[PDB]
Amino acid sequence: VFAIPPSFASIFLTKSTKLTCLVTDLTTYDSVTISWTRQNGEAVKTHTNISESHPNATFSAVGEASICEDDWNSGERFTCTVTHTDLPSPLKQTISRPKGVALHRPDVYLLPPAREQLNLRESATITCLVTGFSPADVFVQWMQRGQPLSPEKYVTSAPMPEPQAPGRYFAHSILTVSEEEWNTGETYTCVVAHEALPNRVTERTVDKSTGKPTLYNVSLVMSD
Amino acid sequence: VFAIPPSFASIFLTKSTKLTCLVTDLTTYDSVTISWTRQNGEAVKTHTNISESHPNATFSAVGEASICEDDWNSGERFTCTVTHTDLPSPLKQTISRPKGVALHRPDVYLLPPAREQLNLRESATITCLVTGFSPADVFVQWMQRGQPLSPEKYVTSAPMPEPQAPGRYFAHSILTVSEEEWNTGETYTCVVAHEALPNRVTERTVDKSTGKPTLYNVSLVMSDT
Amino acid sequence: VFAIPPSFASIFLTKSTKLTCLVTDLTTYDSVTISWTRQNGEAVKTHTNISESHPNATFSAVGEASICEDDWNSGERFTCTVTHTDLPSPLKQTISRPKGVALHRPDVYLLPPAREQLNLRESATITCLVTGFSPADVFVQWMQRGQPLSPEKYVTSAPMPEPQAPGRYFAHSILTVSEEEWNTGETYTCVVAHEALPNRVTERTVDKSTGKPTLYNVSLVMSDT
Ligand SMILES: *[C@@H]1O[C@H](CO)[C@@H](O)[C@H](O)[C@H]1NC(C)=O
Ligand SMILES: *[C@@H]1O[C@H](CO)[C@@H](O)[C@H](O)[C@H]1NC(C)=O
Ligand SMILES: *[C@@H]1O[C@H](CO)[C@@H](O)[C@H](O)[C@H]1NC(C)=O
Incomplete structure (x- = not known):
């Protein structure tokens, strides 16, 4: 049972807490009885979709269901409970939110593209610097002039531990843009979804004139 | 029954979807029969913090219920039933989240205080003109470098209709500060919350240095000759 | 066989290809023997740092063997063979450098810390943007004033594919340093190492005066009244 806990990026991107249940190393058995449950085992929410053939060269399914927000926000556990003949018993591989971690708000510093990149003029890379957040998850998107960009436009690195503070984590988000888009002067905004923020999202923006002095x-x- | 559907300001700020169907204009008895019937008639949740025995004699039946956001966002019909001991006919008040209202994002412009106000050096007001948003309520909050200010320090306006653009709304939100805090460059961030933005929340920043042009x-x- | 190929970070920092092996998930129980093939059958040398008996792979041993740097590239097939009650004959865990990869020169930028970080005055983060490379774990090493800095102060990202490139990949390397250290000059330099580089190393430098104009x-x- 490899039931996936509802990762915070998924529950923020879709605004729906999806708890999935991809049973890895499955057999050629389409009679899998995925009966979802909680510690309060009533009004159970079953799956709504069935997966297809996977790299394990067999037939598998998923246990995607819609649960409420504040049950996982409180820490209510869920169990896929894969009842199958291959398992000796239905495995109680529960998924929940184990609390007991601090909540450090991230501070995002929009780093403009380097001057050495802008001279080469073939591209430009704007690196959001999400740092100092104690839960590991951040959901970083990029929005240009108020409209979000494609997910293929930006790449967000997995959050790695911060050097100085072991509890805090850092993460990166690179948006690769053409250089003529940057010299146009368009504002690129970094939105970071991390849970310790008071509004649960901070927006900072960057443009070619944000490094220029105000006064x-x-x-x-030059002249001849 | 003074039924109050949950506005966005109660839900976003609390993060909790709480609905109230408080009964009033009746002396407090043991005739509490509010049960929060859903679109299928199912019960939801009991209520704890009941109302008071006012001089207006309001009923102590609040009907608080921590109803799921994933249940309320579908906007199905909720009917309150009050099957009174004297009157067996329930007081049917239907409520649902309205859908099809045209989702236009706010255009938050944060306006720094006027120089005629900064000349007094006694109280400075910073206003965010959340404007252009059509779907009814907005929740405006003021933060100062990540620290939200007290709600007794800022007052947001009620959403009034837009003058020229039909079907829109605008909403002010002033922040009465002192000019020492403004002159020291303390960053004030008006943050709004509305269910029409692409990320449902936008922030705007103001400083003393924001308004200065390239003077x-x-x-x-060089090297003319 | 839990064989770890020495990636180019190891063969660049230690200047020696160390043929890390293990007997993890092998049916050998006690007194293991290590055998290595240079594709001519002559590669093994028993080294130190042998781990001890733990319930997975009891009486374990590494297979570390110092074969030169050219050979790993020249493609010697490297198997770690144990002759016991586990499988002695199959040694199909053969690993060498891939013969043809699109070698792309890491064109590296030094992004200075943002002005918000210097206004916070707690720390300054300098990111060594490395973009455009086969991911041979570009060993992005940080030296300040010639001497190398500690591996704890800089954290390097694992290589991740570039969004707008088919076979190029990116990496990041943040040197978390104090704000007072950044303001006082103190060039922090950044070397990134890769096979595709002409000298296997390019370096870049950054300072407070790097982004400043020169003429x-x-x-x-302010003469503030
Ligand atoms: C500022 O000076 C530049 C000189 O290159 C000139 O082109 C520009 O028009 C000036 N702008 C204003 C507002 O005076
Ligand atoms: C600022 O200087 C740049 C330099 O070329 C010029 O293009 C721009 O028009 C100037 N802006 C103002 C407002 O003077
Ligand atoms: C201008 O030059 C002086 C000394 O020549 C130096 O102290 C100062 O930092 C310089 N200005 C800036 C903005 O770097």
Whole structure:
């Protein structure tokens, strides 16, 4: 039983707590009885979709269901309870939110693309710096002029431990853009969804003029 | 029955979807029969923190229920039933989340205080003109470098209709601060919450340095001759 | 066989290809023997750092053997063979460098810390953006004033595929350093190592004066009343 806990990025991106149950190393048995349950074993929410053939060269299914938000936010456990003849007993591989961690709010610092990149003019990379968050999960998206970009446009690194603070984690998000989009001056906004934020999302924006000084526009116009 | 459907400000700020069907204008008795019938008539949840015996004689039956957000977002019909001991006919009040209202995002513009106000150096007001949003309520909150301010320090306006654009709404939110805090450059972030933004929440930032234009356009021409 | 190939970070930092093996998930129980093939049958040398008996792979041993740097590239097939009550004959766990990969030169940027970090004054994070490479674990090593900094101070991202590139990949390397150390000059340099580099190393430097303009030194001074 490899039932997946509802990761926070999935429950924030879809606004629906999906608890799935992909039973790995399954056989050629389509009679799998996936009977979901909790510790309060009543009004159980069954699956709604069936998966297909997987890299294990057999037939498997999924146990995707819609649960409420505040049960997992409180810490209510769930068990897929895969009742099968191959298992000797239905395995009670429960999934929940084990609490007991601190809640450090991330501080996102939008790093503009380097001047060495902008001289090469073939591309530009804007790196969001999500750092100092004690739960590991962040859901980072990029929005340009108020409209979110494609998921293929940006890549978010998996959160790795911070050097100085062991409890805090850092993460990265690179948005690769063409250089002429950057010299246009369009504002690129980084939205970071991490749970310790008071509004549960912070937006910071970046544009070519955010490194320029506000008061003095000191130009250097050459002459013959 | 003074039934109050949950607005967005109660749900977003609390993070809790609580519904109230408080009965009023009747002396407090043991005739509490509110049961929160769903679209199928199923019961939901009991109520604990009942109302008081006011001079107006309000009933102590609040009908608080921590109803699921994943149940309320579908917007199905909720009917309150009050099967009174004297009157067996229930007081049927239907309520559902309205759907099909045209989702337009707010255009939060945070306006710094006027120079005529900063000349007084006694109280400064910072206003966010959340404007252009059509689906009814918005929740405006003020944070200062990640620390939210007290609700007794800011007052948001009620959502009034837009002057020129039909079917929209606008909402002000002022923040009465002192000019020492404004002059020291303390960043004030008006953050709004509305179910029409792409991420349902946007923030805007204001500083003393935000309003200053490029006052000194130095043009160092060299090697002319 | 739990064989760990020495990736290019190991063969660059230690200057020696260390043929890490283990008897994990082998039916051998006690007094294991290690055998290695250089594809001519002559590669094995028993080394130190032998781990001890734990319930998975009892009486374990590593298969570390110092074969030169050219050979791993030249594609010697490397198997770790134990002759006991586990399988002695099949040694199909043969691992060498892949023969043809799209070698792409890591064109590396040093992104200076954002001004918000320097305004927080607690720490300054310098990211060594490495983009465009076969992921040979570019060994992104950080040296300040010639001497290498500690491996604890810098954290390097595992390589992840580039979004707008088919066979190029990116990496990141953050050196978390104090804000006072950044302000006072203190060039932090960044070397990133890869096979596709012409000298196997490119380096870049960053400072407070890196993003500053060079012909004009424009300052701004308040005589505040
Ligand atoms: C600021 O200087 C740049 C330098 O080329 C110029 O293009 C721009 O028009 C200037 N803006 C203002 C507002 O003076
Ligand atoms: C600022 O100076 C630049 C000199 O290159 C000039 O082109 C621009 O028009 C000036 N802008 C203003 C607002 O004076
Ligand atoms: C201008 O130059 C002086 C000394 O020549 C230096 O102290 C100062 O930092 C420079 N200004 C800026 C903005 O770096």
